[PDB]
């Protein structure tokens, strides 16, 4: 549930947009670089016997399609995953906007974590994902966490709990002397 | 405490230091009360509190406050020994006023710098560290220091001096508040000199979370334990509850 | 200004061999990674108004030379950062090994952050990568911000009762003094 900092660049001059989302409990939560690709839902199967191979590194975005559309689906979400990293890919940017199911597909399946990031992006913050990798030529993917700060609320239980132990017993000090 | 004071040397002391006393607790009230109202949006108000007039106004109390804590407790170890050697009652107080307005000046000095207290919220002259006024933080903190030992060589002195049986609860009470204030105080400027040298590095969190506990604690214990520890306090509220009832 | 645990990856399959090298105060210390692409210091000059332009995203390595050696260098070392991202780097790794002053160099440069992070690696630790640019035909090049994770706000929470318990101490002792009265 850790929330996940990608942002896409536009080589030319560079602008840079930024959007949120979550990162997931399959990879192991660190920052990721590269470049945009597009992978169909249905692209990333298993059974087939060779595919065209991409240059290392790339961060693949799957917009994730309706369960009931799909009765016998090739791989679970997790073997999407799985694939992907295999093909070449660095990390690996879901939408799982229409299969709201995949995120519990995913922390499920803490039993073998993947070597590299991989994270959901849902509502509307997916819609302006895709108005960019629908117009845009080329793109430039980074994601990141840098959680800073928190340093006072961790003292403050140590600060409060300790005034209490200092009144508590004043309070016996007083009951004592007047009985 | 005031009303059971207003007549000894050492009655009147406890009078003034309770003026302190209150002036750090309207001090303290001040930033609560700021708080209480800001649930949340603090940052509105704060251009509005430093670059108004208050940010100079509540630092001068503090300082006041703060300063008169240490210049009325310094006498009250030379009246304790001069108790036990043996026109005097009249001329102490001359050096008594003399003592808590002199932090007046101490306190304007740094009003007189143009820009000071645009720094922290609490529009205290230290919690902004050392590069803002670097020559009053180190001689605020001197003054505290060198006022110290005075007061501990008398006390240590007393006990020594000793083998005025109804006096011998004063020389403690005045013992407590001179010992107790350097175990509220002194670590406080640990804390300010940290930002000052290298080898020892503090995150800003603490300094202000451990300032904001400890400026006012030593100013806010004296008068409560002085009803429970004091003898002569029971007779003094006894005293005016018939001129009233 | 942390440690930064600069690794690298050669694919075809995956092998991957780390090192670590310190972040500098020329640019913001965030993580990046691209295809490791080597410079050279005298190639990041910027009179030449046309030079070959890089696909975005590439993680320079620049070895530094004797500082005595060129009597007048055209850019300075904080320079050739900015020019290098200019080209489309993210990230740049000046191997600082020969010319010790060049890190003071870009420590000064607090004036005007850089937007993406500079490392330099120094000792006997940048051999290990300069013999990765030297054998290997293509490799990618992977830094990260923080790589440790450090309890900055988790290790001093028990240091304050720690030091609460002086202050409940030392009026302990007071009471002696005053029961010999
Ligand atoms: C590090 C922290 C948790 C330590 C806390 C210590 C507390 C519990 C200790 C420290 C000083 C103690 C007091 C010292 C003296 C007296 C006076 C006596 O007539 C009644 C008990 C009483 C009032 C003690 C009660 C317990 C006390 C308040
Ligand atoms: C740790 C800090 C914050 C606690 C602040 C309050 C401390 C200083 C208070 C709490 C309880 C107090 C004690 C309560 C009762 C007595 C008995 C009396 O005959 C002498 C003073 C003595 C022994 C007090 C000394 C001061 C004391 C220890």
Redesign the pocket.
């Given at each position: 549930k850790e929330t996940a900092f990608v942002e896409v660049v536009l080589f030319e001059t560079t602008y840079t947009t930024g959007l949120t989302g979550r990162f997931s409990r399959a990879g192991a939560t660190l920052s990721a670089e590269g470049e945009i690709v597009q992978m169909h839902p249905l692209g990333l199967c298993n059974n087939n016997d060779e595919e065209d191979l991409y240059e290392y590194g790339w961060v693949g975005v799957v917009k994730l399609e309706q369960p009931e559309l799909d009765p016998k689906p090739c791989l679970t979400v997790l073997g999407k995953a799985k694939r992907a990293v295999q093909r070449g890919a660095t990390a690996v940017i879901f939408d799982v906007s229409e299969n709201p199911e995949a995120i519990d597909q995913l922390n499920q399946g803490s039993e073998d974590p993947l070597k590299r990031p991989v994270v959901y992006v849902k509502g509307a913050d997916a819609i302006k994902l895709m108005n960019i990798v629908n117009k845009q030529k080329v793109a430039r993917a980074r994601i990141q966490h840098r959680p800073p700060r928190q340093e006072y609320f961790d003292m403050g239980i140590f600060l409060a709990f300790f005034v209490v132990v200092?009144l508590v017993?004043?309070i016996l000090?007083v009951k004592i002397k007047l009985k | 405490v005031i009303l059971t004071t207003f007549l000894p040397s050492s009655k009147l002391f406890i009078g003034l230091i309770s003026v302190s006393n209150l002036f750090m607790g309207i001090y303290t009230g001040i930033l609560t009360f700021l708080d209480a109202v800001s649930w949340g949006r603090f940052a509105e108000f704060g251009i509005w509190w430093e670059t108004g007039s208050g940010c100079k106004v509540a630092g001068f109390l503090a300082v006041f406050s703060s300063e008169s804590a240490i210049f009325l407790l310094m006498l009250a170890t030379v009246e304790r020994s001069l108790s036990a050697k043996d026109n005097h009652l009249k001329q102490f107080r001359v050096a008594a006023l003399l003592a808590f307005l002199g932090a007046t000046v101490a306190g304007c000095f740094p009003l007189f710098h143009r820009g000071e207290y645009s720094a922290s919220p609490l529009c205290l002259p230290f919690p902004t560290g050392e590069t803002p006024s670097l020559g009053f933080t180190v001689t605020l903190v001197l003054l505290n220091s060198l006022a110290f030992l005075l007061m501990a060589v008398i006390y240590t002195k007393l006990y020594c001096n000793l083998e005025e049986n109804s006096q011998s609860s004063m020389i403690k009470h005045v013992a407590w508040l001179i010992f107790?204030n350097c175990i509220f105080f002194c670590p406080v400027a640990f804390f300010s000199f940290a930002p000052l040298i290298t080898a020892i590095s503090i995150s800003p969190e603490i300094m202000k979370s451990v300032t904001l506990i400890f400026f006012p604690?030593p100013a806010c214990?004296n008068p409560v334990?002085y009803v429970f520890?004091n003898p002569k306090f029971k007779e003094d509220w006894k005293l005016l509850k018939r001129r009233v009832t």
């Open positions: 200092s017993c004043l000090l | 107790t604690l214990l334990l520890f």
